[PDB]
Design an enzyme around this catalytic site. Structure first.
Site, PDB file in Angstrom:
ATOM      1  N   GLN A  51       0.865  -1.173   0.000  1.00 51.75           N
ATOM      2  CA  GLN A  51       0.000   0.000   0.000  1.00 51.75           C
ATOM      3  C   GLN A  51       0.901   1.223   0.000  1.00 51.75           C
ATOM      4  O   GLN A  51       1.132   1.838   1.037  1.00 51.75           O
ATOM      5  CB  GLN A  51      -0.915   0.007   1.221  1.00 51.75           C
ATOM      6  CG  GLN A  51      -1.976  -1.064   1.137  1.00 51.75           C
ATOM      7  CD  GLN A  51      -3.144  -0.827   2.069  1.00 51.75           C
ATOM      8  OE1 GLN A  51      -3.725   0.262   2.099  1.00 51.75           O
ATOM      9  NE2 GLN A  51      -3.510  -1.856   2.824  1.00 51.75           N
ATOM     10  N   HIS A  89      -1.784  -0.042  -8.136  1.00 44.88           N
ATOM     11  CA  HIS A  89      -2.477   0.827  -7.195  1.00 44.88           C
ATOM     12  C   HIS A  89      -1.625   1.631  -6.234  1.00 44.88           C
ATOM     13  O   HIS A  89      -0.396   1.641  -6.322  1.00 44.88           O
ATOM     14  CB  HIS A  89      -3.409  -0.040  -6.361  1.00 44.88           C
ATOM     15  CG  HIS A  89      -2.710  -1.191  -5.704  1.00 44.88           C
ATOM     16  ND1 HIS A  89      -2.476  -2.385  -6.349  1.00 44.88           N
ATOM     17  CD2 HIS A  89      -2.146  -1.306  -4.478  1.00 44.88           C
ATOM     18  CE1 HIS A  89      -1.797  -3.190  -5.549  1.00 44.88           C
ATOM     19  NE2 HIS A  89      -1.585  -2.559  -4.411  1.00 44.88           N
ATOM     20  N   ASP A 144      -7.154   2.328  -7.558  1.00 45.10           N
ATOM     21  CA  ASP A 144      -6.629   1.782  -8.806  1.00 45.10           C
ATOM     22  C   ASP A 144      -6.061   2.883  -9.715  1.00 45.10           C
ATOM     23  O   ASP A 144      -6.797   3.751 -10.180  1.00 45.10           O
ATOM     24  CB  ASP A 144      -7.738   1.011  -9.521  1.00 45.10           C
ATOM     25  CG  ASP A 144      -7.200  -0.037 -10.452  1.00 45.10           C
ATOM     26  OD1 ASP A 144      -6.543  -0.976  -9.960  1.00 45.10           O
ATOM     27  OD2 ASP A 144      -7.428   0.078 -11.670  1.00 45.10           O
ATOM     28  N   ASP A 174       3.871  -6.429  -9.411  1.00 42.08           N
ATOM     29  CA  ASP A 174       2.833  -6.976  -8.537  1.00 42.08           C
ATOM     30  C   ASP A 174       1.429  -6.649  -8.996  1.00 42.08           C
ATOM     31  O   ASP A 174       1.149  -5.520  -9.383  1.00 42.08           O
ATOM     32  CB  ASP A 174       3.026  -6.483  -7.092  1.00 42.08           C
ATOM     33  CG  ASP A 174       1.870  -6.857  -6.187  1.00 42.08           C
ATOM     34  OD1 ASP A 174       0.911  -6.062  -6.086  1.00 42.08           O
ATOM     35  OD2 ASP A 174       1.906  -7.953  -5.577  1.00 42.08           O
ATOM     36  N   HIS A 178      -4.285  -7.259 -12.704  1.00 43.60           N
ATOM     37  CA  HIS A 178      -5.183  -6.127 -12.555  1.00 43.60           C
ATOM     38  C   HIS A 178      -4.772  -4.918 -13.397  1.00 43.60           C
ATOM     39  O   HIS A 178      -5.258  -3.806 -13.196  1.00 43.60           O
ATOM     40  CB  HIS A 178      -5.288  -5.768 -11.076  1.00 43.60           C
ATOM     41  CG  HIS A 178      -5.879  -6.864 -10.240  1.00 43.60           C
ATOM     42  ND1 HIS A 178      -5.194  -8.018  -9.925  1.00 43.60           N
ATOM     43  CD2 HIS A 178      -7.101  -6.987  -9.668  1.00 43.60           C
ATOM     44  CE1 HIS A 178      -5.966  -8.804  -9.194  1.00 43.60           C
ATOM     45  NE2 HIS A 178      -7.129  -8.202  -9.024  1.00 43.60           N
ATOM     46  N   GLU A 200       3.538 -10.922 -11.737  1.00 40.68           N
ATOM     47  CA  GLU A 200       2.717 -11.737 -10.848  1.00 40.68           C
ATOM     48  C   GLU A 200       1.303 -11.810 -11.392  1.00 40.68           C
ATOM     49  O   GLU A 200       0.527 -10.863 -11.278  1.00 40.68           O
ATOM     50  CB  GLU A 200       2.652 -11.150  -9.430  1.00 40.68           C
ATOM     51  CG  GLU A 200       1.703 -11.941  -8.505  1.00 40.68           C
ATOM     52  CD  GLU A 200       1.126 -11.112  -7.359  1.00 40.68           C
ATOM     53  OE1 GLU A 200       0.544 -10.035  -7.617  1.00 40.68           O
ATOM     54  OE2 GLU A 200       1.239 -11.542  -6.194  1.00 40.68           O
TER      55      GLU A 200
END
Ligand SMILES: [Ca+2]
Length: 448
Positions: A51, A89, A144, A174, A178, A200
């Site tokens: 994060q 993100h 995102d 990572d 997405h 990933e």
């Protein structure tokens, strides 16, 4: 020859710099994957590292100066650094970062609310039939990023290009599932040179977004290997692995990054209970011996810490190197990359990298397998409840060899620290392996 790399989960730069000089370099590891070095939220949980607040090198692993010292010291030792990069993100909600920065309402020091995708939630079902929602909505609530934005792509690429200047040689993208592969290809057009990058992507099959969509921008994590290898070792027959790899629906070997487990699936994220970890002891040894011996993928040895069940818990409160005292194998760091079997396996792979073929395969049709890598090496694993006393055929030169799994060859090459294997004049070996044990030899571990 470099063929394997390790992931030192939650290890700080100090420990990694030392570990490079003391063990990784000498043993043969090619490189090290480190935890996100950029600024992140405050908290003891391991996932706080995923994060980000900004891209300043002030994390839980140390500061900029320390990070740099680490990259340098490992290079001198012959070990590259791979940096786990967050491209999908930024942090969630509001708060403060490890470097003292504030953020809130999709407003960071380097990103504005307009640099993100409109807020929506990714649902479990979206993975099966809605690639749009998978790559555009928020994953577990994480803001995102708008990976299609030229501004966004430039700031990430600048981050990467800085780490390259510093000397980082590889990157782990990572949560690549997405992020649209198109966006990744754009990003890479801004990245200097061609650094090793692996993505990933968790694809067990039947998903809107396929792992194959990324083979073009770098290597990809093959999670099938993990769950399949684990499932075979636990509930099947090792004799099935005779054709492990593409033959089982896996992606191309030269594109895959395989492993027995990783920080995610060892906590229930991306793998069920059938996955094998350090908690399975001898089972882990055997499984790792297979992976490193088998010519498929780019193996990632795992290096973890005992989290006593708590899947949110962070790393130990003591450095790996405690005033000349190594905190391994106990209730803190497990340091699996140092386990004789695993390191021995690393040695096997390194000295057989000149023959990526599986030769003279043999099995008892159930849980006793054996095969070699041409005249470069030979191995065998016994997972039955009785001694494996079969005579296998090899392509190795007759002589006395050290079982690199239980020891190593001396300087003058006149002795072994572990047991000695003999290959007769006809190239065969009269195996003698107890239950749940293994042997492995190669041409660079021969006596006298
Ligand atoms: Ca996304």
């Amino acid at each position: 020859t470099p063929t394997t790399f390790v992931h030192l989960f939650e290890w700080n730069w100090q420990d990694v710099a030392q570990e490079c000089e003391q063990y990784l370099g000498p043993k043969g590891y090619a490189a090290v994957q480190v935890s996100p070095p950029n600024e992140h939220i405050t908290g003891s949980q391991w996932w706080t590292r995923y994060q980000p607040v900004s891209y300043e090198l002030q994390s839980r692993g140390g500061n900029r100066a320390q990070f740099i010292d680490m990259v340098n010291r490992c290079s001198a030792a012959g070990v590259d650094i791979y940096v786990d990069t967050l491209i999908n993100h930024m942090a969630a909600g509001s708060g403060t970062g490890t470097a003292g920065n504030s953020f809130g309402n999709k407003s960071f020091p380097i990103y504005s609310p307009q640099d993100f995708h409109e807020s929506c939630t990714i649902n479990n079902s979206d993975y099966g039939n809605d690639r749009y929602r998978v790559q555009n909505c928020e994953l577990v609530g994480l803001a995102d990023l708008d990976t299609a934005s030229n501004y966004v792509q430039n700031t990430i690429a600048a981050y990467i290009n800085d780490l390259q200047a510093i000397g980082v040689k590889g990157f782990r993208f990572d949560a690549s599932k997405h992020v649209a592969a198109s966006d990744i290809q754009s990003l890479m057009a801004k990245v200097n040179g061609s650094p090793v990058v692996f993505q990933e992507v968790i694809d067990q099959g039947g998903e809107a977004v396929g792992a194959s969509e990324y083979l073009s921008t770098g290597l990809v994590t093959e999670f099938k290997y993990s769950t399949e290898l684990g499932n075979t070792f636990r509930n099947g027959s090792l004799a099935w692995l005779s054709n492990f790899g593409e033959g089982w629906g896996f992606m191309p070997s030269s594109s895959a990054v395989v492993f027995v487990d990783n920080h995610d699936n060892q906590r229930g994220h991306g793998g069920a209970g059938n996955v094998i970890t350090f908690e399975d002891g001898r089972l882990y040894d055997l499984a790792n011996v297979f992976m490193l011996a088998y010519p498929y993928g780019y193996p990632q040895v795992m290096s973890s810490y005992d989290f006593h069940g708590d899947t949110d818990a962070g790393g130990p409160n003591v450095p790996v190197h405690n005033n000349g005292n190594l905190e391994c194998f106990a209730s803190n760091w497990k340091c699996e990359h140092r386990w004789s079997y695993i390191a021995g396996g690393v040695d096997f792979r390194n000295n057989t990298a000149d023959n990526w073929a599986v030769t003279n395969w043999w099995d008892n049709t159930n849980n006793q397998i054996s095969f070699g890598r041409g005249s470069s090496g030979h191995m065998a694993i016994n997972k039955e409840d009785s001694t494996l006393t079969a005579t296998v055929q090899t392509d190795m030169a007759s002589g006395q060899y050290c079982n690199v799994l239980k020891g190593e060859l001396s300087a003058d090459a006149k002795s072994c620290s572990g047991e000695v294997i003999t290959v007769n004049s006809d190239g065969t070996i009269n195996l003698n392996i107890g239950a749940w044990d293994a042997m492995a030899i190669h041409k660079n571990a021969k006596l006298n």
